[PDB]
């Protein structure tokens, strides 16, 4: 077929080869575990004798020749174009059966795995191909676990190809097992392979899953829900202050979290949107919150350095005044009465806004909401109204968790389903037309 | 009724476990029965420990600690395969061993610690690695063989301990005979030093060991040196370089202390 | 359980029989416990015989004969301490012409069709040593030179008299009592 | 729980809390679901926030087929509707994205030419809307990891956007930055002819410049007016939002145009210099879905809120630290709590094998690799993994093994190798040694006493990566041994008590996962010899109180143990016997 | 080659001198944000000597510019931080390093 003879004249025994391959795999099938010890040992003896006879008659090179002569065709469609369509139907199956037969021939036989070292280099050259990756990886695993000589010929290029298999094909634990077998064989450590695997896999931090110890971050908000809409009796310009009574810069090995600003709700639900209801995420870690930490402006989990007189991270006796303007979308901050040289502008105004603070352990802060809910240290800018003016008449202002679960006893924990939309926040008087 | 002793407690516990359940793990069975035998063979612990016991003066404590650290590095190199860094570490450790005074003052401690055996397994590994592919890391084998010859020259009992491993050395006598600048640093040199000037060891020498050297000499006299002709040397029919080394080993085997061992 | 572990270890296929300290200790313990030792009375001698039968039953009822056959078979004709302990244990369980043990040993061999056992017996017979004039003369010269031997044994001449005697005593105990079946089987 | 519905579930961890169990359930033999438990049951609830996951092969609506790229074509990922034209089909917008992002440059610099292709950082993919799929229902562009907006009616005006305005002292805007999670265009407006085309399917081409952050779109060979400028280091996921109006909706064409790299070059590092387009199996189509669970944390931050006074306002105070271990998926730019791997099997298995590889690379005294690994797995993470009671068993065992191998294995192996040798200096403390502590012949506690035999020296190096000295590479990295010792004693004390109850809640899920790693760490520390005097006394009381009474709580030796635990107990007893033998040898030398 | 921002102010009048040891707590991050080192994790304050070629040049110059009690952010461009070879298994080649360093004490 390679020399391009007529396809019909060429006798290609696909069915007999497939059935013979199945019979050979059954013949070299390893003993089962549930069998009694003596019978299992007898079957192991028979299998080892069969493997030795096959290797002495040189049936491994024949399988390698068949595999090589089948890899000349890129795909099953190409094989069905060159040879018959029925042959192209089972090209993939024949390749898989041949690889399984090779693995069965060499498995558990140290002499066979040692004699396969010469062909080991030829084997890895086709690892990238999707039609043979699993079979080649299994054969590689068997050779590596049995023969210490193969670890002597495995080089930097082979290790890098095995590693790039992880990058191209994804997370496969069998590649990790092969890499582990490359390190230690029969209680002997391979320093060169260990160094190469470490230096070629670890520094990237792009394939293996990464771990880090993260502080929990909680959020507290007042009752007020203020928004902007057409024909709504709602003041669009609000102001409030925060006082830091105490903060520990490092309660743990990780820096203390303390961010203040505004957050928005998705739609008219009172429910903070765009972020996780628990974790290490605070104000500014999503596109619904807008935070200030003393040195940076946080929004969408991206921080930008903002200039301020004697700029510093939030410390004890620091007063942060937050200004929200909904007529023209604008969020501005002033630290200790000095203007922070930065602004959030042109953000979504479809939802409802509320003050919010995010913190980790080691925080003592106070909300100054104006009136009888804290006295402002500084003058509100002209136009801006105190946040306590937004409370509904009957409702009582209180600072509560942004999310609906806290630390408490499990059987006393209140499980909450979805609740109704907070449409009553915006009073749009809609009379009938006359 | 309380056990009151670790030995009694272990003896009760192992039997109780075994008679309570049919243990499926052969490792667990082996561990339990080894521990039970240790409990019932308290004498054997002392019998095995006392040969491994050595006392030293207070003056040489730090020197012995340094020697033990070196030997620990040497032994830890046995669980990793050869590389250039391993060669460097082993060579430095061996240099430290000879620079150590305890190595000379206490040959019995060195023999009890299994130092010469450890060096021999290191040499076994390097020689078995690519034996047909020509010896790799030759300065490694040279340092090991020089160390082993010096160990032989230290004392007669050390010489007998090395003579106990003569068969392997004669198996690997053909390591570096042809290569010059390796004179005095080969397994054949170690074999010669194991029998040198010891009349008792020369008498204890056997006939198959001599026959091995004789067949090597016959091979060198029949066939040329492949490595030598690979470098361009003219292809004579025989191997004088290796023949002379086998001849001098036979000279040390047959001649001792000025007389001729007729046997 | 211990005898089963030892039997399974022997039955596992390996290129060579590894020296096992556990086996070489517990086989010795079992062998000593067997016979566990001027004119005596007939009742006393018969009572000793019955005690020996009970002590041998404690072992061969739990599969000791099969284990000592399997160890010899797995030895593959290589002389060693493992075989030396196995032969001693076989002698201990076979002392007195134990017909039950002889029958168990013959039945196991006939059932399993073990050729390795007899091949290992032939190899161990070939490996047995005899008197050595060369070694004796060398040792005599070494002593006459006046210098004390490094080892006090000096047992190069007639290397393993105990091992040879144990092997042939085992083979004799296997046939004691005019055991025609096993006599023909050998 | 439905809308505005509040309920409570009581699992009967405390039977007194249950109110009707005695009336109906105590006599019938029913047991509370949390009767034999020591810690609260982890509760999982439905996730509110949609996430992108690979399209399942059994999905009843969406089908994805991978079309290999021929010589005259390019690799294509085709999205088709399985149940179009039939009853009960779903006809809402369905959000799609590719599994791997394009990362922009860290710093933005202020036929086809092969050199230009080698030096350029511009990447391209195209989407073909099949003729018959309504194009105004299809959007093409890029999204970031922050996109979680599942709206039935989607339009380009409702995307989440913000403009961070940075100004100088007086107020000059020296820079304005627009930030969003959706950079997409509509095919309906993209069409120049518009309406229905039938010459061919509409080809929308997306071009990204990783060095400048410029996003440009090409429709049918002409440049569209819409463009986007993104921030540095932004990760952009190719995405297509489409409402199905055809059995075949669209396809992801992964080809290339003149002077541009294929998308695979940007995606994969190994193919950074390969101009030939490729579609490796890692790249696959993902869709936004609501079918995911969320793990409610076992413990929450303790926050105190109260009104101090009218003038002082409301006080919010949090003081007690709380931490969790986060697992970060690199390709998805998403992080989850590692305790969520109790239900994510593939991630759990891959991470367990990653830990095994971490142990293997540093196995047998590879101190340089151990120092390198100390960066990836640090000691706070190790301590948290050791102490956590909700950790999966496989991860717990892997982290115990990693902690042993990185810091302790080298010295433990050295001191085991130097165990059967007794080099006893002859000093006054050596002479003071006797077989028995006092006049009566009563054995002292094994290990307790004065040992003078020479032992290997224990030395460690501080794992710092700002230093440039190479002397640190020798010697294993340092770890807090006193803290490890105290924690091990405390956890063993808890485990022995909890084992006697025979609860249904072992740490790690099984008794083996609870005991084998902890006892392995204890045995390693015992071999290393860190334990001294009182710690040895307490841990011998834990093993067996009655025998080791100071001079009947069931110790470790009698708790109906599994075989793996029994083997380690045998190892501990072997070490105790070795200690007794060493004491005997030292006393003999003293008498000598 | 090193830029410095102050996270928290220091005294501002005491600076490291020649051959004076610097006691610092530092946390090392890459530009992407991944943490590769931290003295706070080891709970062991880092001590090094100015002008003794003990640490990387970026860390050296940043600590020199820092005053006592000052917490500062240090970005080290690759030429002064491991160069193009990088650190095997930890730092990728040509990687910019960011350090959050606090000068605890001078001695």
Swiss-Prot record, chain D:
Channel activity is modulated by phosphorylation. Phosphorylation is increased in failing heart, leading to calcium leaks and increased cytoplasmic Ca(2+) levels. Detected in heart muscle (at protein level). Heart muscle, brain (cerebellum and hippocampus) and placenta. Residues 111-259 form the B30.2/SPRY domain. It is found in: Sarcoplasmic reticulum membrane. Induction: By TGFB1. It comes from the Eukaryota. The calcium release channel activity resides in the C-terminal region while the remaining part of the protein resides in the cytoplasm. Homotetramer. Can also form heterotetramers with RYR1 and RYR3. Interacts with FKBP1A and FKBP1B; these interactions may stabilize the channel in its closed state and prevent Ca(2+) leaks. Interacts with CALM and S100A1; these interactions regulate channel activity. Identified in a complex composed of RYR2, FKBP1B, PKA catalytic subunit, PRKAR2A, AKAP6, and the protein phosphatases PP2A and PP1. Interacts directly with FKBP1B, PKA, PP1 and PP2A. Interacts with SELENON. In cardiac muscles, identified in a complex, composed of FSD2, CMYA5 and RYR2. Belongs to the ryanodine receptor (TC 1.A.3.1) family. RYR2 subfamily. Cytosolic calcium-activated calcium channel that mediates the release of Ca(2+) from the sarcoplasmic reticulum into the cytosol and thereby plays a key role in triggering cardiac muscle contraction. Aberrant channel activation can lead to cardiac arrhythmia. In cardiac myocytes, calcium release is triggered by increased Ca(2+) cytosolic levels due to activation of the L-type calcium channel CACNA1C. The calcium channel activity is modulated by formation of heterotetramers with RYR3. Required for cellular calcium ion homeostasis. Required for embryonic heart development. It is linked to Ventricular tachycardia, catecholaminergic polymorphic, 1, with or without atrial dysfunction and/or dilated cardiomyopathy: An arrhythmogenic disorder characterized by stress-induced, bidirectional ventricular tachycardia that may degenerate into cardiac arrest and cause sudden death. Patients present with recurrent syncope, seizures, or sudden death after physical activity or emotional stress. CPVT1 inheritance is autosomal dominant. This is Ryanodine receptor 2. It comes from Homo sapiens (Human). The lineage of its organism: Eukaryota, Metazoa, Chordata, Craniata, Vertebrata. The chain holds residues 1207 to 1929 of 4967 of the full protein.
Swiss-Prot record, chain E:
Signal peptide: none annotated. It is an enzyme of class 5 (isomerase). GO terms for cellular component: calcium channel complex; cytoplasm; membrane; sarcoplasmic reticulum membrane; Z disc. It is found in: Cytoplasm; Sarcoplasmic reticulum. The keyword Transmembrane does not apply. Belongs to the FKBP-type PPIase family. FKBP1 subfamily. PANTHER family: PEPTIDYL-PROLYL CIS-TRANS ISOMERASE (PTHR10516), PEPTIDYL-PROLYL CIS-TRANS ISOMERASE FKBP1B (PTHR10516:SF429). Has the potential to contribute to the immunosuppressive and toxic effects of FK506 and rapamycin. PPIases accelerate the folding of proteins. It catalyzes the cis-trans isomerization of proline imidic peptide bonds in oligopeptides. Identified in a complex composed of RYR2, FKBP1B, PKA catalytic subunit, PRKAR2A, AKAP6, and the protein phosphatases PP2A and PP1. Interacts directly with RYR2. This is Peptidyl-prolyl cis-trans isomerase FKBP1B.
């Amino acid at each position: 077929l390679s020399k391009k003879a007529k396809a019909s004249t060429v006798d290609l025994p696909i069915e007999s080869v497939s059935l013979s391959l199945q019979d050979l795999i059954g013949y070299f099938h390893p003993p089962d575990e549930h069998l009694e010890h003596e019978d299992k040992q007898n079957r192991l003896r028979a299998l080892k004798n069969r493997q030795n006879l096959f290797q002495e008659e040189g049936m491994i090179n024949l399988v390698l020749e068949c595999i090589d002569r089948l890899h000349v065709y890129s795909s099953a469609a190409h094989f069905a174009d060159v040879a018959g369509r029925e042959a192209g139907e089972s090209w993939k199956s024949i390749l898989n059966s041949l690889y399984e037969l090779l693995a069965a021939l060499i498995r558990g036989n140290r002499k066979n795995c040692a004699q396969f070292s010469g062909s080991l280099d030829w084997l890895i050259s086709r690892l990238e191909r999707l039609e043979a990756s699993s079979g080649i990886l299994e054969v590689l695993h068997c050779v590596l676990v049995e023969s210490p000589e193969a670890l002597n010929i495995i080089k930097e290029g082979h290790i890098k190809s095995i590693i790039s298999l992880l990058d191209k094909h994804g997370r496969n634990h069998k590649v990790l097992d092969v890499l582990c077998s490359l390190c230690v064989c029969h209680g002997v450590a391979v320093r060169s392979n260990q160094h190469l695997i470490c230096d070629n896999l670890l520094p990237g931090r792009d394939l293996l899953l990464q771990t880090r110890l993260v502080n929990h971050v909680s959020s507290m908000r007042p009752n007020i829900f203020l928004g902007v809409s057409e024909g709504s009796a709602q003041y669009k310009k609000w102001y409030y202050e925060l006082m830091v009574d105490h903060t520990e810069p490092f309660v743990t090995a990780e820096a203390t979290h303390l961010r203040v600003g505004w957050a928005s709700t998705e739609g008219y639900s009172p429910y903070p949107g765009g972020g996780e209801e628990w974790g290490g995420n605070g104000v500014g870690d999503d596109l619904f919150s807008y935070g200030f930490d003393g040195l940076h402006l946080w929004s969408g989990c991206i921080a930008r350095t903002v200039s301020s007189p004697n700029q510093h991270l939030l410390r004890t006796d620091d007063v942060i005044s937050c200004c929200l303007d909904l007529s023209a979308p604008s969020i501005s901050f002033r630290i200790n009465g000095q203007p922070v040289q930065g602004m959030f502008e042109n953000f979504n105004i479809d939802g409802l806004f509320f003050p919010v603070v995010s913190f980790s352990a080691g925080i003592k802060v106070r909300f100054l909401l104006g009136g009888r809910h804290g006295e402002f240290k500084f003058l509100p800018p002209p136009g801006y109204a105190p946040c306590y003016e937004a409370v509904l008449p009957k409702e009582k202002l209180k600072v509560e968790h942004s999310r609906e679960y806290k630390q408490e006893r499990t059987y006393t924990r209140d499980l909450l389903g979805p609740t109704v939309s907070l449409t009553q926040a915006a009073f749009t008087p809609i009379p009938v037309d006359t | 009724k309380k056990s009151s002793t670790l030995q009694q407690l272990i003896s009760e516990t192992m039997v109780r476990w075994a008679q309570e359940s049919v243990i499926e793990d052969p490792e667990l069975v082996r561990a339990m029965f080894v521990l039970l035998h240790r409990q019932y063979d308290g004498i054997g612990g002392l019998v095995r420990a006392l040969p491994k016991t050595y006392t030293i003066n207070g003056v040489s404590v730090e020197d012995t600690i340094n020697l033990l650290a070196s030997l620990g590095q040497i032994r830890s190199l046995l669980s990793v395969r050869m590389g250039k860094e391993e060669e460097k570490l082993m060579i430095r450790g061996l240099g430290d061993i000879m620079n150590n005074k305890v190595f000379y003052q206490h040959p019995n401690l060195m023999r009890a610690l299994g130092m010469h055996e450890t060096v021999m397994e290191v040499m076994v590994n390097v020689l078995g690695g690519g034996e047909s592919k020509e010896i790799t890391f030759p300065k490694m084998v040279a340092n090991c063989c020089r160390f082993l010859c010096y160990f032989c020259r230290i004392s007669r009992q050390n010489q007998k301990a090395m003579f106990d491993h003569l068969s392997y050395l004669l198996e690997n006598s053909s390591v570096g005979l042809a290569s010059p600048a390796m004179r005095g640093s080969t397994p054949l040199d170690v074999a010669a030093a194991s029998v040198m000037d010891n009349n008792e060891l020369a008498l204890a020498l056997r006939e198959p060991d001599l026959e091995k050297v004789v067949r090597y000499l016959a091979g060198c006299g029949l066939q040329s040196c492949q490595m030598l002709v690979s470098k361009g040397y003219p292809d004579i029919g025989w191997n004088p370089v290796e023949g002379e080394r086998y001849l001098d080993f036979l000279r040390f085997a047959v001649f001792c202390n000025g007389e001729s061992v007729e046997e | 359980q211990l005898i089963l572990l030892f039997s399974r270890t022997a039955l596992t296929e390996k290129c060579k029989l590894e020296e096992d300290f556990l086996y070489m200790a517990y086989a010795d313990i079992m062998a000593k416990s067997c016979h566990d030792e001027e004119v005596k009375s007939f009742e006393e001698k018969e009572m000793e015989k019955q005690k020996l039968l009970y002590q041998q039953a404690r072992l061969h009822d739990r599969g000791a004969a099969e284990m000592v056959l399997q160890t010899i078979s797995a030895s593959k004709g290589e002389t060693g301490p493992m075989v030396a302990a196995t032969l001693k244990l076989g002698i201990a369980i076979l002392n007195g012409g134990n017909s039950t043990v002889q029958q168990k040993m013959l039945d196991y061999l006939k059932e399993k069709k073990d050729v390795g056992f007899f091949q290992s017996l032939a190899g161990l017979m070939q490996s047995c040593s005899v008197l050595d004039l060369n070694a004796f003369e060398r040792q005599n010269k070494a002593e006459g030179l006046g210098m004390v031997t490094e080892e006090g044994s000096g047992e190069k001449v007639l290397q393993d008299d105990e091992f040879t005697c144990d092997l042939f005593r085992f083979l004799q105990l296997l046939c004691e009592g005019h055991n025609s079946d096993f006599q023909n089987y050998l | 729980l439905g809308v505005a519905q509040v309920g409570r579930m009581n699992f009967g961890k405390d039977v007194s809390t249950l109110k009707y169990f005695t009336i109906c359930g105590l006599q019938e033999g029913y047991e509370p679901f949390a009767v034999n438990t020591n810690r609260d049951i982890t509760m999982w609830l439905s996730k509110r926030l949609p996430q992108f996951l690979q399209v399942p092969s059994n999905h009843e609506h969406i089908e994805v087929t991978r079309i290999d790229g021929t010589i005259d074509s390019s690799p294509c990922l085709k999205v088709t509707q399985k149940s179009f034209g039939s009853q009960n089909s779903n006809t809402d917008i369905m959000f799609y994205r590719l599994s791997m992002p394009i990362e922009c440059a860290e710093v933005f610099s202020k036929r086809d030419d092969y050199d230009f292709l080698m030096q350029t950082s511009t990447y391209y993919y195209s989407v073909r809307i099949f003729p018959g799929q309504e194009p105004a229902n299809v959007w093409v562009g890029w999204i970031t990891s922050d996109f979680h907006q599942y709206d039935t009616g989607f339009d380009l005006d409702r995307v989440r956007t913000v403009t961070v305005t940075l100004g100088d002292e007086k107020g000059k805007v020296h820079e304005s930055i627009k930030r969003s999670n959706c950079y997409m265009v509509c095919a309906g407006e993209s069409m120049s002819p518009g309406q229905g085309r039938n010459n061919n399917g509409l080809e929308i081409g997306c071009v990204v410049d990783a060095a400048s952050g410029l996003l440009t779109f090409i429709a049918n060979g002409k440049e569209l007016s819409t463009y986007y400028q993104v921030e540095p280091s932004t990760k952009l996921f190719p995405a297509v939002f489409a409402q199905a109006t055809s059995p075949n909706v669209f396809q992801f064409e992964l080809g290339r145009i003149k002077n541009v790299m294929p998308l695979s070059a940007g995606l994969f590092k190994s193919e950074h210099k390969n101009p030939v387009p490729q579609c490796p199996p890692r790249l696959h189509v993902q869709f936004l879905s609501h079918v995911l669970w969320s793990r409610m944390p076992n413990q929450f931050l303790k926050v105190d809120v109260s009104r101090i006074s009218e003038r002082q306002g409301w006080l919010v105070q949090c003081l007690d630290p709380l931490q969790f271990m986060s697992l970060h998926i690199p390709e998805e730019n998403r992080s989850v709590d590692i305790l969520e791997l109790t239900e994510q099997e593939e991630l759990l298995k891959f991470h367990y094998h990653t830990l095994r590889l971490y142990s293997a690379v540093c196995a047998l005294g590879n101190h340089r690799v151990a120092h390198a690994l100390c960066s990836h797995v640090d000691e706070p993470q190790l301590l948290y993994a050791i102490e956590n009671k909700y950790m999966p068993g496989l991860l717990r065992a892997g982290y115990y093994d990693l902690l042993i191998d990185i810091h302790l294995s080298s010295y433990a192996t050295a001191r085991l190798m130097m165990n059967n040798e007794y080099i006893v200096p002859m000093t006054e403390e050596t002479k003071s040694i006797t077989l028995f502590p006092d006049e009566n012949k009563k054995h002292g506690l094994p290990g307790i006493g004065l040992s003078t035999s020479l032992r290997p020296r224990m030395q460690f190096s501080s794992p710092s990566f700002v230093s440039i000295s190479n002397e640190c590479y020798q010697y294993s990295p340092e770890f807090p041994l006193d803290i490890l010792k105290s924690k091990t004693i405390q956890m063993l004390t808890e485990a022995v008590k909890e084992g006697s109850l025979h609860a249904r809640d072992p740490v790690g899920g099984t008794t083996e996962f609870l005991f084998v790693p902890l006892i392995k760490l204890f045995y390693t520390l015992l071999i290393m010899g860190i334990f001294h005097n009182e710690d040895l006394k307490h841990i011998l009381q834990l093993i067996e109180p009655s025998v080791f009474k100071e001079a009947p709580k069931e110790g470790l030796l009698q708790m109906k143990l599994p075989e793996p635990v029994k083997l380690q107990m045998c190892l501990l007893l072997q070490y105790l016997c070795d200690c007794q033998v060493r004491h005997r040898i030292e006393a003999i030398v003293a008498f000598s | 080659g090193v830029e410095i921002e102050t996270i928290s102010p220091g005294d501002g009048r005491t600076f490291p001198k020649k051959g004076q040891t610097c006691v610092v707590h530092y946390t090392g991050m890459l530009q992407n944000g991944k943490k590769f080192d931290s003295s706070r994790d080891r709970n062991k304050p880092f001590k090094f000597r100015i002008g003794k070629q003990e640490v990387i040049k970026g860390f050296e110059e940043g600590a020199a510019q820092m005053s006592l009690g000052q917490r500062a952010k240090l970005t080290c461009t690759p030429d002064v931080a491991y160069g193009a070879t990088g650190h095997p298994g930890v730092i990728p080649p040509n990687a910019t390093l960011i350090f959050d360093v606090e000068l605890l004490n001078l001695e």
